[PDB]
Amino acid sequence: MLPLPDFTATFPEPFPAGPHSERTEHRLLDWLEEHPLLPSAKAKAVLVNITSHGASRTFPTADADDLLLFAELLLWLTAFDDVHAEGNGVGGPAALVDRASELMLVLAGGNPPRAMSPFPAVLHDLLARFRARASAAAYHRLAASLRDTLMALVWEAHHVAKPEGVALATYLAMRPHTVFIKTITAAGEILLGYELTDTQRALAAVRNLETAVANLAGWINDLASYEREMQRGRGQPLSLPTLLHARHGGTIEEAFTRASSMCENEAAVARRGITHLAHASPNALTAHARALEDITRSFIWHTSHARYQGI
Amino acid sequence: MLPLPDFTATFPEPFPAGPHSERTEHRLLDWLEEHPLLPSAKAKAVLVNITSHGASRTFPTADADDLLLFAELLLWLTAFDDVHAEGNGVGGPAALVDRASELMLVLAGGNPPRAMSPFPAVLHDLLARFRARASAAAYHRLAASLRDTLMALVWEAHHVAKPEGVALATYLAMRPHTVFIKTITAAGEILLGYELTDTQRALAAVRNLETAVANLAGWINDLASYEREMQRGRGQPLSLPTLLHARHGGTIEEAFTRASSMCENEAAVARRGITHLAHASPNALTAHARALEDITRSFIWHTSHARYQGI
Ligand SMILES: [Mg+2]
Ligand SMILES: [Mg+2]
């Protein structure tokens, strides 16, 4: 009974999915057999399913092998967040810092000490396969996005106990890093075989679209996962409706109406940006517009998945 | 009366300094007038002095303007550490995480909210001037080194209260990131106008030298600053002698003998690496060997400075 955003004018259903969803879903389960990252087998089944099926919507052009690589990086990242960063209440922020520092050493290169967690070694392998596939600058972009996300997960872990201690503007700036949108995009430039010049990245039209997509991804995730987060023992989660409710007073229903309004407007900005940037002739600016459209559609798709709700 | 390493066989005095030490020292004080980063004026005078004079030893080839840019980045970084990361005992690790997250947003690009600390805005400007001067890949390297250092400063802040909770091997891997050696080297490749291919960076000879220099820089800093760190209220610092003392038992004098022995051996490895890599003909591998030699000499020089001791 919480009002939700309506994207029928901006991103209507259905969202095209590529062919290799079931193959990816099986190859992911075999991969996770040599490399267990998730305690429960049910947890593994839900996360493998939304990852493979969501990845088919994210990069429908696909290429079963490239899709599996991205699906492996995204599941590794989501599992790391779900295990350590979100966690449950053991070791606190400091344990996540230790786990994030091990990953930073992997990203820096150069034979760090072996870790007891499996996450560093899987990351080492995934970065290796991406380095082979990408341009030097493109791999640097992927590695930077992961470094930035690790700092933002550390930041979040220090504020979940008192969400009301966070200013709304700080949350809006940090949330694109905890929703993984920059890793997904940087992985897309590699796997779709394109790349922007640094002058293109500075274009107002490119920046404004990337911001709107980042905002939309974080905010719909926030709305989609709120009710589930309440059902835990802890209080209100660190997310958009919680901060709007704190800012404006009133009720959670009104916070959701405001948040749903913010999402619809962001979706309209994003649609306009996709349309502007797809008329451009520099060609790299197209494809990028289309990649961001598919990324956005996938994010809207996966809010109906059981990871966020029930039945 | 604590035994110290002897580098006369490997890095004999004196260490060549370039011309622009006093000019840099004045331009730094004028820069810090428009951008106060340091509370005390005496603190400012000591840190400006070791930075300008040390930078003359680090890049003797210099070029007064390029030297001032590097000197500004190094002083900004050292001041950030000294203010927040080291701090004194207010806000804890969580305040440093908030300050580091603001800097991560600067490094990610894209108009974050304005901060009340001056450190983010100065970083924004310094990265701008380095982006203009560097190749795309080279700037990415500089930005990655800073991201990695910010995570390692966060890690350190979570362990200084219980240094004995850190395993020696973890400390040795993390310390190159809190001593800033990778930022200094990456800044050197830009300012000295050279750059390695990723295959060159993978050469065993290149890697082994970079590791020995990173180790030596962190360890001599540890030894040079130990007695000063004790003179604070807190206990033993998170640094090499503290962990050797914990590992082996015995006395602090014996810890320093062991640490001094580790430094002399690392210096011998580094000398051998400099000599091997300077015979090579790929030319980028020279100059890099010479840049690392100068970086190493500067680190040995600044242990005699008043920042570390008295008179
Ligand atoms: Mg999260
Ligand atoms: Mg420090």
From TrEMBL, chains A, B:
Residues annotated to bind Mg(2+) 2: 81, 86, 156
Pfam families in UniProt: Terpene_syn_C_2
InterPro entries linked: Isoprenoid_synthase_dom_sf, Terpene_cyclase-like_2
Entry keyword set: Lyase, Metal-binding
GO molecular function: metal ion binding; terpene synthase activity
Annotated positions binding Mg(2+) 1: 81-82, 86
Top-level enzyme category: lyase
EC number annotated for this UniProt entry: 4.2.3.-
Binding, Mg(2+) 3: 221, 225, 229
Key word Ribonucleoprotein present: no
Protein name as annotated: Labdane-related diterpene synthase
